[PDB]
Amino acid sequence: AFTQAPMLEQNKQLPPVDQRLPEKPLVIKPIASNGVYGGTLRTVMRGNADGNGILRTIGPQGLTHWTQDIQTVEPYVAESYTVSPDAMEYTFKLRKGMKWSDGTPFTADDIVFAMNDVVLNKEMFPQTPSAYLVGGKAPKVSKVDDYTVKFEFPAANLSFPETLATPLGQHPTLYQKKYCSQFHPAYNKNVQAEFTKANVKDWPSLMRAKCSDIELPSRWSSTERPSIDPWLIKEPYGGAVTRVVMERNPFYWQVDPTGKQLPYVDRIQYAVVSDLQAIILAATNGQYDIEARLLGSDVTSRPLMLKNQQKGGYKVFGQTSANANAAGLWLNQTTKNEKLRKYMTQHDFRQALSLAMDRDEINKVAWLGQAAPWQSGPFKESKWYNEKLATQYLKLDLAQANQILDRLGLTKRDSDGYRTYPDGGRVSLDAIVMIDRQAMVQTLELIRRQWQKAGVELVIKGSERSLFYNRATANDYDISIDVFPGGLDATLNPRAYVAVHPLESRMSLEWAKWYLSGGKQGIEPNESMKKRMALYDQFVAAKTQSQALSLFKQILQISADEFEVIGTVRPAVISSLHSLKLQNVNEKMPFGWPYATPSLSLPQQWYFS
């Protein structure tokens, strides 16, 4: 019954299609219609550090997968799975006969190797990635037979199936044991010979170079790394390539309802382009069949995109960002500026800084009026909605800001009109920002002038993305501006409400380091933050959905009371485009990294009309 692409008819070494598919392949229901084979999907990456663009184009192929409405997940690579009544035990059934891109078997051996020999190997990952932890506690992972793998957590872990559908939860399917064991000392007695044959000097760097990790550029730099991906790297990503080309995986493990082995589209070609203006011009000319990653957050792109739809042969669809805030102020409560810290740690000082802001002016100038004032909370339709976390201190009230700052003792003025500390110099805050995010830079420039009227100085420190993260983890900043997640994905990314992300919980990464190390590194958080961390552990280890619900709402209320991070606007709509000839794009899908959009729309069932 099963049929294949005409392009694979010419490969005479390939087995017949029913032997390359699993016995029971996953049947993909198309978004709008049954498709036809053929064509090259044209799309775009910006620069040499945009490998996630490939991931978000072809899609993470994890054990589970989001529904189109992102409310729940379904078995994906797993045929099915069970969960014990206590929710500590997850048993995954794999698809018998499934194969890697090189024709060799996909079995529990691969999942057990990826878990035990890579993810949970402490030489490879000194800090075990959090996706596979419950409150810091690791699972025991074992093979029950060739097509059954068991995960045993020391505590209840209701979120694990949702984790397995995010990009960061795809390790279990990322490593073929046979190829990857060559580069692992527990398997290759002569792993030293491979170190020389590469530019490395230890087995963890060897693994990263040859087998890679979720977000490493090495994931897309070679054709020989096996995968279960719908398309395989053919012309690879590299430090200075002008293009990337990917070709259908002849051993892909999915069919459409009529029995066609997917994908429909034969090839994907990514143009690798440096300056954003060339991407805008190429997109508005209709040279890309899909662009749902790069322009949509740039609000000045939208009028251009809409105007050229007919000219360029494309349709713009607007996506709903999952982030609660498009450009939020993370205030560092462990700032190294001692004089500043005595005010940073005071609730009412943070309240003043929010009251001295004009979110209508920010929306007008930097977001072309397409956003709306908001702080850090989930949106109204979320069951997590908290009004205070969303809407406190949104209206400009400069007279109240100035009264508060006076009450705090910041009444002495310097020769330039700024407030000073009672003992010290000018009230001045350093804010780090990625210079490429022009809207965020412009937001800070507007905040600087707004806060100038309260006698507060904002110093803007733009930088490359690399130095921006080095300053953060070095604890060398007072404010860092970036998105607040949580509008739609609060329990997937609670980092704005509790300091649990080591790179992004920038109310203090030192507090985050304390959480992640069980108190042995970092700086001890304040009582309200420790309280939220203990409740967070209870939340992730909750035994029922109703216990989880109460515990996470407690965390959100304490976050609202503390008011540690200051939102500017919730995001404007995210403007994406697809070629009019490209069928089966879910134009209603939300936008977000936890869903790896646009690949949430199942690009293996896109086709050309």
Author numbering: 2 to 610
Task: Copy out sentences from the published article reporting this entry, exactly as the authors wrote them.
SPH1118 has been identified as a pectin-binding protein involved in both pectin chemotaxis and assimilation. SPH1118 consisted of two domains with a large cleft between the domains and substrates bound to positively charged and aromatic residues in the cleft through hydrogen bond and stacking interactions.
The crystallization conditions of SPH1118 (open form), SPH1118 (full open form), and SPH1118 (closed form) contained the substrates (ΔtriGalUA or sodium PG). However, no substrates were bound to SPH1118 in these structures. The crystal structures of SPH1118 (full open form) and SPH1118 (closed form) were obtained only under crystallization conditions in the presence of sodium PG. Two molecules were included in the asymmetric unit of the crystals of SPH1118 (closed form) and SPH1118/ΔtriGalUA. There are a few examples of proteins whose domains are closed in the substrate-free state, as observed in SPH1118 (closed form). There is little structural difference between the closed forms in the substrate-free state and the substrate-bound state.
